[PDB]
């Protein structure tokens, strides 16, 4: 199935905030309405914050994360979970080798700011 797709409310505010978890350089891009929006890139094997922005949703309210490594798509999986009916998380993990951690770029989407 398709991952790292989702529909947020038009025209918001939201967080975007990737970690890095490999050997291999990261690179996180985050689509608006199907146009980059934001790209984070970094290496680290401790969790290191490589991005954090502030983006909007637009008219479309369609956000897409994509995570690569040197130009290679990595795996992603995704799912979005909201707490008490107004916080909402978008989550995605990424695995770009065979140990199946997922957790090579980790990126968080947070809605709403304020
Ligand atoms: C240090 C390792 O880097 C990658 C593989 C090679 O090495 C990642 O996929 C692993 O999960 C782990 O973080
Ligand atoms: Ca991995
Ligand atoms: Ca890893």
């Given at each position: ?26 690179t ?14 970094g ?17 479309s ?54």
């Amino acid at each position: 199935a398709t991952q790292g797709v989702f529909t947020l409310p038009a025209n918001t505010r939201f967080g975007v905030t990737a970690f890095a978890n490999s050997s291999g350089t990261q690179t996180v891009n985050v689509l608006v309405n199907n146009e980059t929006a934001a790209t984070f890139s970094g290496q680290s094997t401790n969790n290191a914050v490589i991005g954090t922005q502030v983006l909007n949703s637009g008219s479309s309210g369609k956000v897409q994360v994509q995570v690569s490594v040197n130009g290679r798509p990595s795996d992603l999986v995704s799912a979005q979970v909201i707490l008490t009916n107004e916080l909402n998380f978008a989550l995605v993990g990424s695995e770009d080798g065979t140990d199946n951690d997922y957790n090579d770029a980790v990126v968080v989407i947070n809605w709403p700011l304020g």
